[PDB]
Amino acid sequence: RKPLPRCALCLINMGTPVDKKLAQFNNWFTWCHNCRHGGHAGHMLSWFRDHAECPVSACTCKCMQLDT
Amino acid sequence: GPSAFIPVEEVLRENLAVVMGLHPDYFTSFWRLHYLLLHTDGPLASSWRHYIAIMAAARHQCSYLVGSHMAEFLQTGGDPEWLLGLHRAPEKLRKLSEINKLLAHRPWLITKEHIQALLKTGEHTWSLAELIQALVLLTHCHSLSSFVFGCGILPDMLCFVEDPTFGYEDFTPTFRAQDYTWEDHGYSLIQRLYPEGGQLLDEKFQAAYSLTYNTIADTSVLRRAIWNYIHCVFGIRYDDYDYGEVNQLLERNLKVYIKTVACYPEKTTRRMYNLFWRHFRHSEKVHVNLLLLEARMQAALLYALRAITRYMT
Amino acid sequence: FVARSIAADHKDLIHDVSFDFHGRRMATCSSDQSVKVWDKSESGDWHCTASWKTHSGSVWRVTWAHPEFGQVLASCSFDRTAAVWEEIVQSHWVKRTTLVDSRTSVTDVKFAPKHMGLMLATCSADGIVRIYEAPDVMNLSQWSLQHEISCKLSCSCISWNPSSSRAHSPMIAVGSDDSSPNAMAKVQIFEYNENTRKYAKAETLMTVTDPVHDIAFAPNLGRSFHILAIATKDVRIFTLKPVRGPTKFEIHIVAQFDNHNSQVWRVSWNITGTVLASSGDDGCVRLWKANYMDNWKCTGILK
Amino acid sequence: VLTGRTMHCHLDAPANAISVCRDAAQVVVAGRSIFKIYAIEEEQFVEKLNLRVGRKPSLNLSCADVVWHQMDENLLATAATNGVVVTWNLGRPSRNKQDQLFTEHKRTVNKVCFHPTEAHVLLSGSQDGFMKCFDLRRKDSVSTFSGQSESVRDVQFSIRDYFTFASTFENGNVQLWDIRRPDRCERMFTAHNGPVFCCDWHPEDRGWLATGGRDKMVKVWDMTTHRAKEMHCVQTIASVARVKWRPECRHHLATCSMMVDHNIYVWDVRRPFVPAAMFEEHRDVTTGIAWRHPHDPSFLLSGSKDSSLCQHLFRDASQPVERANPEGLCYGLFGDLAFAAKESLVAGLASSALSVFEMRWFVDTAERYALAGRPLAELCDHNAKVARELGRNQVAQTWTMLRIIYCSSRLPPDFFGVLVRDMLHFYAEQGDVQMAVSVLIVLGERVRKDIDEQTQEHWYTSYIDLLQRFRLWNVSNEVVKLSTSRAVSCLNQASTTLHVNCSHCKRPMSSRGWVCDRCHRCASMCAVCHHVVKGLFVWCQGCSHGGHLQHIMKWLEGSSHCPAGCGHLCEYS
Numbered sequence A: 001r002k003p004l005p006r007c008a009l010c011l012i013n014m015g016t017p018v019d020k021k022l023a024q025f026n027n028w029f030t031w032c033h034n035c036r037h038g039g040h041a042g043h044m045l046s047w048f049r050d051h052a053e054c055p056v057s058a059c060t061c062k063c064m065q066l067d068t
Numbered sequence B: 001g002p003s004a005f006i007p008v009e010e011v012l013r014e015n016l017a018v019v020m021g022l023h024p025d026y027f028t029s030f031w032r033l034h035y036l037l038l039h040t041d042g043p044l045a046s047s048w049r050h051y052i053a054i055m056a057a058a059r060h061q062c063s064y065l066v067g068s069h070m071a072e073f074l075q076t077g078g079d080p081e082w083l084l085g086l087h088r089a090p091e092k093l094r095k096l097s098e099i100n101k102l103l104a105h106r107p108w109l110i111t112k113e114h115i116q117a118l119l120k121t122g123e124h125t126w127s128l129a130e131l132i133q134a135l136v137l138l139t140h141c142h143s144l145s146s147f148v149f150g151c152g153i154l155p156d157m158l159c160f161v162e163d164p165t166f167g168y169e170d171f172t173p174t175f176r177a178q179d180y181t182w183e184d185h186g187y188s189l190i191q192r193l194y195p196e197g198g199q200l201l202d203e204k205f206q207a208a209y210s211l212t213y214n215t216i217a218d219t220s221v222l223r224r225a226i227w228n229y230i231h232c233v234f235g236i237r238y239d240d241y242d243y244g245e246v247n248q249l250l251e252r253n254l255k256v257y258i259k260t261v262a263c264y265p266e267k268t269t270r271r272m273y274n275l276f277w278r279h280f281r282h283s284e285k286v287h288v289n290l291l292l293l294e295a296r297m298q299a300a301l302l303y304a305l306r307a308i309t310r311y312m313t
Numbered sequence C: 001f002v003a004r005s006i007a008a009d010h011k012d013l014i015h016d017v018s019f020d021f022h023g024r025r026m027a028t029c030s031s032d033q034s035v036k037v038w039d040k041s042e043s044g045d046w047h048c049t050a051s052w053k054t055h056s057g058s059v060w061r062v063t064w065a066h067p068e069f070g071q072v073l074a075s076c077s078f079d080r081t082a083a084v085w086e087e088i089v090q091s092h093w094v095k096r097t098t099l100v101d102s103r104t105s106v107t108d109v110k111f112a113p114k115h116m117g118l119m120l121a122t123c124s125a126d127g128i129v130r131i132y133e134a135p136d137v138m139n140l141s142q143w144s145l146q147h148e149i150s151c152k153l154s155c156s157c158i159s160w161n162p163s164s165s166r167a168h169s170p171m172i173a174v175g176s177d178d179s180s181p182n183a184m185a186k187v188q189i190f191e192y193n194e195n196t197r198k199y200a201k202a203e204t205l206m207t208v209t210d211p212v213h214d215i216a217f218a219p220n221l222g223r224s225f226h227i228l229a230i231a232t233k234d235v236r237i238f239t240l241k242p243v244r245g246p247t248k249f250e251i252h253i254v255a256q257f258d259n260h261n262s263q264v265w266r267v268s269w270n271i272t273g274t275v276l277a278s279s280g281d282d283g284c285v286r287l288w289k290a291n292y293m294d295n296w297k298c299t300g301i302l303k
Numbered sequence D: 001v002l003t004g005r006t007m008h009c010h011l012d013a014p015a016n017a018i019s020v021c022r023d024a025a026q027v028v029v030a031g032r033s034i035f036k037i038y039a040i041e042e043e044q045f046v047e048k049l050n051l052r053v054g055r056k057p058s059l060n061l062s063c064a065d066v067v068w069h070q071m072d073e074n075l076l077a078t079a080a081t082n083g084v085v086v087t088w089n090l091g092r093p094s095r096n097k098q099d100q101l102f103t104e105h106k107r108t109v110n111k112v113c114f115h116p117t118e119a120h121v122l123l124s125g126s127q128d129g130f131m132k133c134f135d136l137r138r139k140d141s142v143s144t145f146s147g148q149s150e151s152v153r154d155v156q157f158s159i160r161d162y163f164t165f166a167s168t169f170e171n172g173n174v175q176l177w178d179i180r181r182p183d184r185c186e187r188m189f190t191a192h193n194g195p196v197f198c199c200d201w202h203p204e205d206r207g208w209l210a211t212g213g214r215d216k217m218v219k220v221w222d223m224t225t226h227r228a229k230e231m232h233c234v235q236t237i238a239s240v241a242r243v244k245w246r247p248e249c250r251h252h253l254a255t256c257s258m259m260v261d262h263n264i265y266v267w268d269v270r271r272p273f274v275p276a277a278m279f280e281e282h283r284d285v286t287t288g289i290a291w292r293h294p295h296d297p298s299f300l301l302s303g304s305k306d307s308s309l310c311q312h313l314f315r316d317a318s319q320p321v322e323r324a325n326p327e328g329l330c331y332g333l334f335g336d337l338a339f340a341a342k343e344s345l346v347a348g349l350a351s352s353a354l355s356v357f358e359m360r361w362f363v364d365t366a367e368r369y370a371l372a373g374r375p376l377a378e379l380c381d382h383n384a385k386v387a388r389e390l391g392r393n394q395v396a397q398t399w400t401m402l403r404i405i406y407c408s409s410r411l412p413p414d415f416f417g418v419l420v421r422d423m424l425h426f427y428a429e430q431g432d433v434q435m436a437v438s439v440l441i442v443l444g445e446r447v448r449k450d451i452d453e454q455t456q457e458h459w460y461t462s463y464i465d466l467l468q469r470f471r472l473w474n475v476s477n478e479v480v481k482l483s484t485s486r487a488v489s490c491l492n493q494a495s496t497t498l499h500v501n502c503s504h505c506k507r508p509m510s511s512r513g514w515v516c517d518r519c520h521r522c523a524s525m526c527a528v529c530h531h532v533v534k535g536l537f538v539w540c541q542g543c544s545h546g547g548h549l550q551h552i553m554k555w556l557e558g559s560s561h562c563p564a565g566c567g568h569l570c571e572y573s
C-alpha cells in the first residue's frame, strides 16, 4: 500500500479494478519504451493526436512516431 | 508438545492456538476478535497496533506475545530502529505508559485526571476513537498474557518498561457492582465510540459465559463462585452473592492457583498446576484457567469505561 | 431561465445540495436521516443512484471532496459525529471513519483547499471548532485531530479561504448564531501562524450583531485581496486588504442589500467569483454583480 | 387548574425514580441514598418529610422503583436493590411507617406496579425471568410466574381492562398474561433487537401499546387483531429508558435517554424524524419522567442523577423546529443553481421542493488559441483572429497592440514596460487569467522579469485548476510544459515514471532498451502483429499481456478476449 504512478496529463494516480463494464480500456496503462513515461490510454491518445512530444515537461523524444 | 504442563498424550487425545481449539465456540469468537482488532483497517495504523500489543504484552513477561508481535511488526512497514526502547519511540506513546501501568498491575487508581492528560492539546494528541482502540488492545493483550502462562505454553524486554518493579498489591472507595454494568451502561458507550468492537466483545462475553463444567459432586454454582471471586479480587462487590459459598465452594488449592495466575502469572509451576484437582480432565482445568482472562477483561473494561464516562458528565 | 422540478422522494426537509467538482454530480441530504446521490444523463435528466442511510439524527450540511483523493463525501448530523463516506467499485458507498469528539451536535463540515492536503473542519454548537488531517492519503481511516479553537459563542457556519497563493496563509471564518440581547460580534477570522504553528485571532467584524445564518468566501482566481459574504437578515459583502502575530487587515463594507424583506438563509458564489447568489424567507433567489466601479447591483430574480 | 412556573429545587443525593399521587400535590423522589417526599406548591416546592430515617444505612432502603396508589393516598410501595418488595403505609403514626416486608425473591427486582382498580393486588418483576404476584391480605403469595426469559423490566398493568397484564424482557420479547390463568402467556411477539427498557399503554386508545428499547427505536403496536401489528416507529439518538404518554392528546410521547443524552423529547408519533419539544435543564441523564396530571396537557415532572427535581411546561420548551434552516443552494460548473426550500416557502410543513435553474467563451478559446512554435507576429495575429471570431474585441486590440509594441529618432527601449505590467495586473485582477497567462507565455522573457514569482505562480495555478475543472487536459498540460516558472514545470515530473520487468526472468530492464539481459527474449512484442514495440505499450493488469496502443484498441472493439490467448475478458465486456 504505497502510491501507484500517475498520468502525466490527469496528474491522478493510475489503477484498475483487479454487461456492466468493470474496467474500461481508457483507464489502462500505457508507456513509452524509451522514456518510461506513462498515463491513461485515452488521455495519451488524445494528446498525441494533436501533438507529437513526450507529455512530461522537459522530456524530449517523439514518443509515438518511434514505432509508427 | 505445545505445553510442558499438560501431557502431550492428553493434548493429542483431546503455536499456542491449537491449545485453545478444544473449545470450538470460544476459539471462533476469540479469533474473530483478534482478526478485527489487529488486522482490519481502523483509526490507528497496523504498526502502531503491533507496538501497542508489544507494550501490553511486555508487562507480564510473556515471552511468546512479545515475540511474533515484534516479528510481524517489522513486516508491516514498521521502523526497525524503534525496538531500541521507548526512549527511541516517538513522543506519542510516551503518554500511554502511565495508563499501561495500572491496566496490568493495579486497575483501581484510574480516574478522570488520567484520561484528561491523555486527551490534552499540544503537538501530540489523541482523539476518543483512537484511544478507545488502544485501551481495548491493551486489555486484550493483558488477558492473553495471563492465559498463556495459565496454560504454561512452550514456544531486551527490560529496555521497554518504565519502573519494571511495580507488581500487583493484594488490595487492602470500592466499586459497586450493579451501579455501572456492562449489559446496560458500558455497552452503549463502547458501541457509540466503537460499533464493531462492542459487538465482538459482547459475543465473546456471552460465549465464555455459556460453557459447562460437567464433573461436579448443577454446573452453575461453581461457575458463579469462580466468576465473582475474581471480581471481588479487583474491587467490584456484588451484594447479592453470599460469600460463604466462595470459601465453601472452592478448595484453597484452587484459590491459590487462580490468584497466582491472575496476579503474578510468571510464578506458576508444574507443581503449582498439578497441586489442585488431580482427579479431573485437563479441559476441566482449562475451562477454569480460561475464564479468568474473561473476568479480568470485564473488570478492566468496566473500570476504564467508568473513568471515561465521568469525563463527559 | 427555466426550472426543472425533480422528484425528491424524501420524507422530510431537504437541507443542502452540493455539486461535484466536475459539475455532473450532486448530493442531497435531509432530516429524514439519509443521503442520496444524483448523476446527470445524456438527455440532461437527473435520476437517483444511491439511497443509503447515514446517521441516526437529522442530517445537516453534506460536502464533496476533490476527486484527486477519490469520490469521498462527508456529513454531519444530530448525532454528535462526522463521517467520511466513500464510493467503491455495481458500486456502493461504504463508511471509512466516524469522528466522535463533540458533546453537542455538529453544525457544518467543510473540506480544505487542495494545496494544504486532505483536511476537514467541523464546528460544534457549544463553540468548539476543530481541524482534522489524513496524512496517509490512500486509506481514509487514519484521521487525526490537529488544532482546537474556542469561539466563546455558538457556532453555525464555517467557510474556508480558497486563495492558492503562497503569500496568503490559510484562514477560516466562523459564523455565530446566538440571539441573546447582549450585542457583541458574530463573525470572526482565524489565521494560521506558521511561525508558531497555531491558529490565531486575526480580525473580528464588530458591525455584525444580528444572527449570522450562512457564510462564504469568494473564489480568488487572481485577486489580490479577499472578498467575504454573510447571510444575516441582510446581505453584506466585505473586502479585506492585507497590509505588507497575525497580519493586520482593513475591513470595508461594500454591499448593504435589503430588498429581500426577509431573513437571508444561504449564500453561494460562482466559480470565477464575480456573481453572488442568495435565498431568503421571501422565497426567491437573487444574483448580484459588480458594475465595474465597486458598485454592486441586482442582475436577476429567480423564483 | 394547576398553576406553576418553571422552577428547579435541589436534592443532596442522586435519585432514580419518581411517582405522583392522585391529588397532584406531593411527589415521591427516591434513589439509592434518598427516600424523601416533596409537596408541590403554587410557587416553590419545599421539603415535607423524610422516610429514610433508620439509624443505620441498611440495604433495604436503596430503592430502584417507587409507586404510589391512585385511590389510597396512604399506601406506598417500592423495590429494594436486593430483592425486598417492602410496602409502606403512612396510616401507622409510628414514624418509620413500614409495613409487610417481603424477601421471597431471588435476585435484583426491577420494577413494581399496582392495579389502578384494586388496592390489594400487587405485582413485581426481577432479574430471574420471574413475576412475583402478591395479595396484601398478608396471605403467603399469589401466582409466581415462570417467564422463561432473561431479566424482566417495566412490568406495568392495563388501564381500561382489569385482567390484562404485560411485561417486557431483556433479550427482546414482550408478553401478555392473565391473573386467572397463570400457566401460559396469552400472547407472544418479538419487538426489538436488544433489551426492551420501557413499556406503557395508551390512556385514550385501547390496545395501543408502545415499547422502547436499546435499539434506539420506539414502536407502537396494535393489539386489536390477533397479531402484533405495527403502526408507527420513531428513531431517536440513544437508548430509550422511559416512554410516557401525554394525556388528553393522542399522538405525543415523552422519552428520556439512558446514556450521553441528557435531554427529554416530546415526539409526535405522526412525525417521527424531528422532535416536537425539547427540555435542556439538567447536567446528567434524566432517570425519571412522570406527569403531574390526572388529565391536563402541559405539566411534566422529572428527576435525574445530578440530584435535581424539576417541573416542566409545554410553553417554555425550547422548540427546535421553529428555529432551523429551511433552505440550501449551490452553484454548478457552467450554471446550475439548485434551490431547495420548504413547501410552505414556495407555495404541510415537512417537505421540500428541488429545482435546478440554469462560459462557452472560456472553453472555446482554450483549445483554439496558439501559444508557441511560430514567431511573435504569427502568434499575435492568430490569437487576434481567434478573439475577433468570438466577439471579444478589446482583447484582439490588445493582441495587435502588443505585436506593434514588440515586433517593431526612436522611442526609448524600456518605454512600454509599465504599461504591459499594468495590463497584466488589470486582466488578472478582474478574474480573467486566460489572457494574463497566455500573454505571459507568448511574450516570455520580454516581460517575465518584471513581475514577482508569487503572483506568477498564483496565475498559473488558478488557470490550471480552472482548466482541469472542465476536463481540458490537453491545454492544461500544454500550460504545464511551457510554464515559465520552475515551480509549475514540475507537476508532471513527480511519480510518473514506471519500472518495467520481464515476465520470464522477473528482473528489471534498463531505461533505453527492448531486450532482456538474461532472458535474451525481446520482451516487447505486440500480441496482435508480433512485432517489436518501441514506443507506446498498453498493459492489461489481470493478464500481464499487451501490445501496440492502436492494435489493442481495434482488437478490443472487435472482440473481448485477450489477443495473446488465455481465458480472460480483459474488460469484462
Ligand SMILES: [Zn+2]
Residues within 6 Å of the ligand: A032, A035, A036, A037, A054, A055, A056, A059, A060
Ligand atoms: Zn518521458
Ligand SMILES: [Zn+2]
Residues within 6 Å of the ligand: A007, A008, A009, A010, A011, A039, A040, A041, A043, A044
Ligand atoms: Zn490520464
Ligand SMILES: [Zn+2]
Residues within 6 Å of the ligand: A032, A033, A034, A035, A036, A037, A054, A061, A062, A063
Ligand atoms: Zn518517449
Ligand SMILES: [Zn+2]
Residues within 6 Å of the ligand: D502, D503, D504, D505, D506, D516, D517, D518, D519, D520, D521
Ligand atoms: Zn527475460
Ligand SMILES: [Zn+2]
Residues within 6 Å of the ligand: D526, D527, D528, D529, D530, D531, D547, D548, D551
Ligand atoms: Zn502491434
Ligand SMILES: [Zn+2]
Residues within 6 Å of the ligand: D542, D543, D544, D545, D562, D563, D564, D565, D566, D568
Ligand atoms: Zn491475457
Ligand SMILES: [Zn+2]
Residues within 6 Å of the ligand: D540, D541, D542, D543, D544, D545, D562, D568, D569, D570, D571
Ligand atoms: Zn486481460
